[PDB]
Amino acid sequence: PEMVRGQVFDVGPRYTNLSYIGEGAYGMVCSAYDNVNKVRVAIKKISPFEHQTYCQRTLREIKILLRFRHENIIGINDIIRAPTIEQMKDVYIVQDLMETDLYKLLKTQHLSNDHICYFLYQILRGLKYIHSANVLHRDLKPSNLLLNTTCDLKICDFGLARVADPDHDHTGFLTEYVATRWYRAPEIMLNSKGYTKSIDIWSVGCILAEMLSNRPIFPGKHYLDQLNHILGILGSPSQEDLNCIINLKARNYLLSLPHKNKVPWNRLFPNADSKALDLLDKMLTFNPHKRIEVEQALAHPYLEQYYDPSDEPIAEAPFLPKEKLKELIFEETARFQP
Ligand SMILES: CC(=O)NCc1ccc2[nH]ncc2c1
Known about the structure:
Blueprint: E1 3-4, E2 7-8, E3 15-23, E4 28-34, E5 39-46, H1 52-67, E6 78-80, E7 91-96, E8 100-101, H2 102-108, H3 113-132, E9 135-136, E10 145-147, E11 153-155, E12 162-163, H4 186-190, H5 198-213, H6 223-234, H7 239-243, H8 248-256, H9 265-268, H10 274-283, H11 294-298, H12 322-332
Antiparallel strand pairs: 1-2, 3-4, 4-5, 5-7, 6-7, 8-10, 9-12, 10-11
Helix pairs in contact: 1-12, 3-5, 5-10
This protein binds ~{N}-(1~{H}-indazol-5-ylmethyl)ethanamide.
EC number: 2.7.11.24
GO biological process, one term: myelination
InterPro entries: Kinase-like_dom_sf, MAP_kinase, MAP_kinase_CS, MAPK_ERK1/2, Prot_kinase_dom, Protein_kinase_ATP_BS, Ser/Thr_kinase_AS
């Protein structure tokens, strides 16, 4: 039984020569030589079985990623676990090894306009597929966008994903939310559960802005401070957009704020391509009903050199206590067993 950083990393004889990568949500991450395909691979250890939430998220991701097949979405290549429920304490998910991710790249590398364009294209191409399956990722951020040595990009981490449910999207003001703060659309803090596709487009807009400067655009330090970062750049919502927020606590909060003017994108991003800023503006639209959709974003002039809807595939179809969820993780991973 191989050990890494003083813990069992029990990946069998198939996978050998482990090197520590980093530290996931529910366990450790390593590379390993795959003795069957003769390539190094990434493997993450997942120990979710005590907690119903870690079980829920583990199972959501497994079910989604096994059903999806797309060049810009990470696959599951193998899953390692014990032969019986009783002996299964952990699950190992094997995926393609990727050199880096966008978070690491942004902290260390200047991106050319050509790189930004290509990364954005790949993100949206992957997102077209996800949305075509009626699924929302709900936690798009640089550290969930993996890149290889030739800058192929794959979206990962579907633990917070949901089926879209726009008829149940409304909630009150200051309703708590789980997904990463800096990439949360303004409506999350006002009146949205994050059950519509527009939530993901906002996050992509934040990612685009961060590619342009290497700095997150709206780095809020706490729940409501996130909204006030957004409003500091977008400025005060218009009457029409304010009138769409029927909830009085949310509406009156916005009305209580002093008038803020829009910060022009070309002053925030003086070296950016003008077509990139036109698309950014459309993704970072305050009103989620007016926000650009994924397929429109692909068709935007900024992406013209890549846009090819015949080569931007869609999914073939649309997509509980911890004891039942352990059984379900066991069943879902059975296809990888001898
Ligand atoms: C967000 C996440 O789950 N990161 C860990 C991870 C997953 C797959 C990976 N492939 N290559 C490297 C690598 C890292």
